[PDB]
Amino acid sequence: KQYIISEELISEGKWVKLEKTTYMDPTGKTRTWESVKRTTRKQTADGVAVIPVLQRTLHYECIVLVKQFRPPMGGYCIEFPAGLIDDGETPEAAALRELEEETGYKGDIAECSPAVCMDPGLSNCTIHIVTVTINGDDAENARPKPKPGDGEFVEVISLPKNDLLQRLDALVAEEHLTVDARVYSYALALKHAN
Amino acid sequence: KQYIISEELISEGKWVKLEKTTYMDPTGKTRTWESVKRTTRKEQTADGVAVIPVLQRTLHYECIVLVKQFRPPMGGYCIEFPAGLIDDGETPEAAALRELEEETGYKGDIAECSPAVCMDPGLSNCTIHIVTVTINGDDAENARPKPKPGDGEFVEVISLPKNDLLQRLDALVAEEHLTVDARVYSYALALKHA
Numbered sequence A: 001k002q003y004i005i006s007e008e009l010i011s012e013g014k015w016v017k018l019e020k021t022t023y024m025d026p027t028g029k030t031r032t033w034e035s036v037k038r039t040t041r042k043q044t045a046d047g048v049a050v051i052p053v054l055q056r057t058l059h060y061e062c063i064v065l066v067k068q069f070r071p072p073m074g075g076y077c078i079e080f081p082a083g084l085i086d087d088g089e090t091p092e093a094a095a096l097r098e099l100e101e102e103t104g105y106k107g108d109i110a111e112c113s114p115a116v117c118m119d120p121g122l123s124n125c126t127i128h129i130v131t132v133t134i135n136g137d138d139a140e141n142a143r144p145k146p147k148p149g150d151g152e153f154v155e156v157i158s159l160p161k162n163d164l165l166q167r168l169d170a171l172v173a174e175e176h177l178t179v180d181a182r183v184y185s186y187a188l189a190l191k192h193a194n
Numbered sequence B: 001k002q003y004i005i006s007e008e009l010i011s012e013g014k015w016v017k018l019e020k021t022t023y024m025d026p027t028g029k030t031r032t033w034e035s036v037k038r039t040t041r042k043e044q045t046a047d048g049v050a051v052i053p054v055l056q057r058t059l060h061y062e063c064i065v066l067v068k069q070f071r072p073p074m075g076g077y078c079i080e081f082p083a084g085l086i087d088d089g090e091t092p093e094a095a096a097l098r099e100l101e102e103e104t105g106y107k108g109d110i111a112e113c114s115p116a117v118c119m120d121p122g123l124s125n126c127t128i129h130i131v132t133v134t135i136n137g138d139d140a141e142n143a144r145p146k147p148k149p150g151d152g153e154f155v156e157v158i159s160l161p162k163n164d165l166l167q168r169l170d171a172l173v174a175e176e177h178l179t180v181d182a183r184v185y186s187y188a189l190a191l192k193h194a
Ligand SMILES: CNc1nccc(OC)n1
Pocket: A015, A016, B032, B033, B034, B035, B122, B123
């Protein structure tokens, strides 16, 4: 019933553009929306976000997260390891690469989502969420060596899966960080299950 | 260590603006970013709310109530938590309960309210509160609920059992052209992983 009629470029940067979208509303009335897109999409999705489940025997399972300064936020954020997918890279491969660059951990693929939207009222940005387990008892994940790219500065924060939400709430109250909504959503469902 | 030095307006619409952000990297070097912001945020502790609406009914499995809408930035239909912007002076809880009623017809009861969490922190400063709400589906107010959607709002309600949410979402993605929201998907994954 609804669909896009046209897209007008308002402004194009190197990484981001703003467009004025005309669409037909379900009454047959024509309407406009201000829409953002990244200029980098080739791919199944713009990017991947990795849910990295650190498994060590006789320890709690942890979810491995990252903390970085995010210029659009004007502050530090706690997020799942994540990045853009390289032209002709698979989402799975992008997931293991990014996880290694940002954390130093080497993991195994458990499952991969379809493309999911980041903020669909604002942008067309999409990611695959890739669940990865990390055998924390293997020698290659003993002393994880992060190989981050140029101009990336990432701190790794591992938190127990079974207390994730309370641990996150504490980091916000204590460190004035912003937790990512996908991370928070995941944490909430862990408590809400059953 | 890191901080914002300046934010230069590139382009401002009615709803969204694009900014050139200058900030200090941790080596002590000046760098830039292209940042998106909404123009609608005033004193609110976030731009908006997303509601996690747990429909509870005697001798029924708990359902998560979701909405399906056309999203101009995406050029297609998306499945999301009920959600909207917080009106000036409105509390996040009030916004959540109001948007839930408007989008779904259901009258909820507040369970919990998250701190402000970031939508896509490498792109925008956009933030939400994630508000968990229970819906007493035995109450007569919630028997035959009707959306009371605003001007240019056109929403379908999809209630899925919490105990099978990921599979039911996957089934929906298999059968039509549409995109699941990344927060919805994250929540569904954790319900499996728990
Ligand atoms: C979405 N904006 C953006 N992405 C990547 C790099 C950058 O500036 C160097 N700006």
